[model samples]
Target: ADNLTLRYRSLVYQLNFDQTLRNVDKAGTWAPRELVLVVQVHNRPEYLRLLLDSLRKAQGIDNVLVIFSHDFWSTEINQLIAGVNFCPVLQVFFPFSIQLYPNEFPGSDPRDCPRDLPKNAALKLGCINAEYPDSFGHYREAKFSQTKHHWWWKLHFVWERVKILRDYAGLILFLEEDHYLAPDFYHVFKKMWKLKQQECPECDVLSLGTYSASRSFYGMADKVDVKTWKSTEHNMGLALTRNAYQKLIECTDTFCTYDDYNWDWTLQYLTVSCLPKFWKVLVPQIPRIFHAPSTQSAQIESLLNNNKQYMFPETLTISEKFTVVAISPPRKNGGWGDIRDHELCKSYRR
Candidate 1:
């Protein structure tokens, strides 16, 4: 019972990266840049291949370090990452993934309550964590909670433990395996970054993508907007400096204890409740990033392909619409009621 606990801590405590590489032994030798791009990945090879193809074609990509953070240990995916020679690549695996703890606390404990079990029935049956149910009266599902846990753990690991980032004084941009980037992703990101530095130094975040799925990017490519951070709009292609990272660290308790399974929604709750000030973000009018839907219809595929054609641009005009909406803090949605998860999440702070 307790061996899994020890193994989990041991795995997390040992922070390692770039362990398995095919080329570019030293990232600084060939691909050296201040930008650190981290991609959160799961079991999606085809999507990742398309994303990688776009990244390989992305302008100024050789100047950035790309790190693929994985929670799923796929032999095929590992080899795929190893074959990249265009730029610097690093890989970090989530140690406490469900695959590693299939029959354990962090996974799905046999003693855990069923997803839809009644609270009274759960307590009567003496299920573990029966005393705690989410606001929605749901129990923790490993599939749902693992992503949130991985996101939190990855943030902490990258910021605090990654030796390469110890002296790195640049924005760390985050993406996922399913996300495809425009050819000019680095270009637009550079423009937005300069805008933030020259004009909106107070902007706590820089986002290269928004939630719009429209195919109109002909005239809006060189446009930008500044607004208060909302996870839904700014979560994709999101970049932040250590200042914002520290603010998030300060609210570790509020974030870890929140019952929302989605990391972005929990972050939305933090902006309203835990943080001292609302974080502001600078975003391009037309996104340089696109989330390829898992099940894309012909209509969606055609639209994204059309938008990809307009991703090549050199100049961008600026606009400042820093709107701060009055938002009430959201209630916890539950699914994070396990005592083991709470302790493990909080342990990452050390």
Candidate 2:
């Protein structure tokens, strides 16, 4: 053990990855210093690396607990993540991954029919296996529906199944592999947290990433805003408090069984009936996150690939610069029309 170059730069934050890798010491009174990021990662090692690069650039990351929940396990991925030295890292492996049981109930059975069948054709098979067509009619694959299941599991485990978030009083930020964060992301988040309830009492969600790849310059000013929950404008780079998250657990069955392929739409549908209280989102005019395209290019978002990080400066001062705004989109029909799904969802109620 004299000369192992630790893959993780835990040296930066004086973290002891050696001792904590096997099992985190969570028996004592442990509380996160700032925010907790719950990231669900898949096979994109490169995308995960890019997100980590930007993450290292962020300030106050050491105070955060970066939970990497893996849906598909790879030795390379595990080894790579073991090197995360900047923050307190923990790995939560989903036990029921479709990859582990590819030719089983949740996964596609090769003998039953051809894998990767068309949606309509898949429906015929789903009809034969399960009696719910109104429910998410799409075939559950190792790839397509895995994210939704992972997300639902994450919510339940983080709040009920584990004690990770029990000590922290702030918000939990959910992110994917492809999205990159601004250097000032955490700083701005702190400001928003303080100003949120004061400015918009009804606001329950915090949107760290709202700028669509196509809608880059939507915000014309130097401020962030808060709006009531609308699926069209909010989704990724999201943050919610413990209380808000608990409400979602109460609606877990609905989230897991909804008729949409995308979990985002299912969450939106909950706003109508499932969620205990309708959500309001706190967002910014000048985005703190931009979707990074997976190619060789200047990583410019928040400022269109700015030559200087200042034009889209890597960091900014969180001030009393915020406004409360609201916008709503027409209700979406996610096709949750089957009565069977509702019956199952009802049994899921806690």
Candidate 3:
């Protein structure tokens, strides 16, 4: 890939071009000890509030930059978002016009539902529906249906970030609207980034979330057998490295052209499973302090069960598999986990 420089304002602050450009250069030279948190949210103000609150309480508060990308049609929700106190919030609307029928103007009317079309129909209509439905506009029109949109917004969010990296160099931690962080989430990630650079030099992907597996053996840090780690499916929680972003951007054509329904699964299969020869790190023990209302447990378990059968043939020493399971002190009321409770000990004892 050729070295190229781009100039643009980050969605937040409208920080001047000179400052933004300087930051990019500095980011590359300094290796961006800073973390850019990227979030994709839609119609979930309450959940977004919780997520932002968790971020504000993250251990390294000064070193963080938060970017939020959303497509909410509700003015009340948008107002709620505008009032957030976090530093550097970048909110982007979905490019529905680019993804909609006939590549036509999706009406500016806020009442229109973007995820109402069938996946195939949406593709044909050139309309990118926010969720998956069984037939054309049936689910959205019915208003009580249970079909999920295809989740192409995730790919769009990632690609948009990739383009911005043309002017910035740093790790981006991508999160969905429904996730909440553990108290020690930032602390654990900082440590993991250090370890990743030292141990897995060729790693292209950093998985921060994993299944709530039987915690029969907790508090163990294991260097997961590279092959085994590569074979599993997982979520994108706090992935780091500007270099990784560059790689993803370089491979954008490969990523965007694929027709896979699940964006995260596609990333998991392509980057880790299908290309084990390309080095990537899979930290199995870092438990994500995800909220339960979204049925996160079931979701993680499903990914794990589907990918568990594809484990690497080699076995790793137990110590190498379990990394530091530090419990983060609570910063707010009604957070994800028991701040003082060291569940790691109990999990390991099982």
Candidate 4:
């Protein structure tokens, strides 16, 4: 049913796994027949611990498979993951992450063009990827690009290379290290799964959380929103059926070459441009999950600047040449200029 790509096949063998669901199941009968939570983790063990705690509290947690996909290798984090015993837990590492290639392409190459270098100057200076400057005239920054790479790789590895996924038929809810689950997330997930299958079979995506500005959970707890999917709105705690995953995989060319650095925006580009039809999603009104992103000093500085513009109202008028809502021709973000990344990403299509 799928092509076995040599690149990823090699990667599958290279990537290490601590344990499998079957190994952790004491009765040795459990398999991920209904649901699996695939968490993309960086080095934030503290936030990961919080997420793990919430997952442990989730009702019917024992029935689901928890796979923590790590991009950074650390004894502390590995030990933390090893300590989990509430349910079947597994670990999958991204072998090509920046941590493993600190001095190479996926990391920072010494000869690569600097982020702000002009294309003409770069070409004259004989820097690598001089002809591939981003639309904004910026060059690649390894740290900024690694996340997108990891996200794409994880998606491919999970759906295609993972042997366990072949036998399991369930929606894979993709999560991050900082997301906290509600105690009844499993119950809500089951309800939404049945709702999609029976009442809204046409839905291609499912939303487990919403970035709502409102502070009313109980009031909207029983509501479900069905509409064309929006990346900004439905990017977090999202799940997709195998059919939808296959559809996305078909657009590997567009996704790998898209100029955007963020995977969600790249996906949005795919939704509007590459796919045969626009995708739709089913979202619950009261999210069963919440994001608790760690605060950074730069974010605080930006918040101060944003506070200055608060309460300022301005009138809007139609521009002389404003087009209908749509993404313009793709712009290259310099970070993805490296051919090695593109080749590796494109190879995942198989």
| Candidate with the greatest lDDT versus the true structure | 1
Minimal lDDT window, size 10, model 4:
310-319
- For 1-350, candidate 1 gives per-residue lDDT tens digits of 25755555455445364344324656445433557899999998888887787788688876577888888766788787877888767787788788777888788889988988999999999999787777788777878888888898889888887766666788899889878887787888877788788888768888987878555777787888878787778889899888999999899898888877788888888888898877788888887787773455344446656777566666667775545673543566677877667777877788
On the 0 to 100 scale, the lDDT of residue 306 in model 1 is 78
- By TM-score, the best candidate is 1
Total clashes in model 2, counting residue pairs 3 or more apart in sequence or in different chains: 8
* Each candidate: RMSD: 3.5, 7.7, 15.4, 9.5
Off-target runs (Cα >4 Å) in candidate 2 are 1-30, 110-130, 134-142, 212-222, 293-297, 301-350
Global lDDT for candidate 1?
A: 0.78
Clash number by candidate, in order: 0, 8, 24, 0
> On residues 94-118, what C-alpha lDDT tens digit does candidate 3 reach at each position?
4332222122222222332344444
What C-alpha lDDT do the candidate models reach, one value each? 0.78, 0.62, 0.43, 0.71
Q: Tens digit of lDDT per residue, candidate 4, span 258-297? A: 7777888788888888987677777776566777744532
Per-model TM-score, in order, reads 0.88, 0.75, 0.55, 0.82
Model 3 TM-score is 0.55
Please state the error at residue 350 of candidate 4 in Å.
Answer: 4.7
lDDT of 1 at 202: 68
